[PDB]
Amino acid sequence: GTGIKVFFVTPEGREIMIEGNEGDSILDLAHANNIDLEGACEGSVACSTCHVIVDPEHYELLDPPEEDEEDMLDLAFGLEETSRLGCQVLLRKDLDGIRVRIP
Ligand code: FES
């Protein structure tokens, strides 16, 4: 398929499954579907409002975070081992079925 499944759990504990395309960031999908993941700095790696926690399995599939993301993540509330900036995790076909939780 061209659709890539993304499972979202919101801070309220709601669970949503949506499909994205290659290139779509988790932040885009969030906005596209009224998941309340704010993107203060609009993808410029200058905030932490797009912080999401990805499942461990798909986490290792990802291009690891660059230095600007890592550093910014240190201001993110609720940081975990598999935390990422949602605007920096972009969908690929091998990431199908990825789970993101919004702290
Ligand atoms: S929107 Fe600010 S870092 Fe992703």
Tokens of 37: 């993941």
Give Cβ neighbours of residue 28 (< 8 Å, ≥ 6 apart).
Answer: 20
Mutate to test the pocket of ligand 1, among 50, 66, 90, 100 (most ligand atoms within 8 A of CB): 50
The string of DSSP codes covering 10-77 is -TT--EEEEEE-TT-BHHHHHHHTT-----TTTTSS--STTEEEE-HHHHHHSPPPPHHHHHHHTT-T
Residue 87 assigned as binding residue: yes
Tokens standing for residue 81: 């081992």
Ligand 1 atom nearest the C-alpha of 41 is 2
Span from the CA of 5 to the centroid of ligand 1 (angstroms) = 22
* Separation of first and last alpha carbons in the chain: 30
Q: What is the DSSP letter of 90?
A: B
- On whether the 1-103 domain is CATH 3.40.190.10, my answer is no
Way the structure was solved: X-ray
Residue 93: phi and psi, rounded to 5, are -65, -30
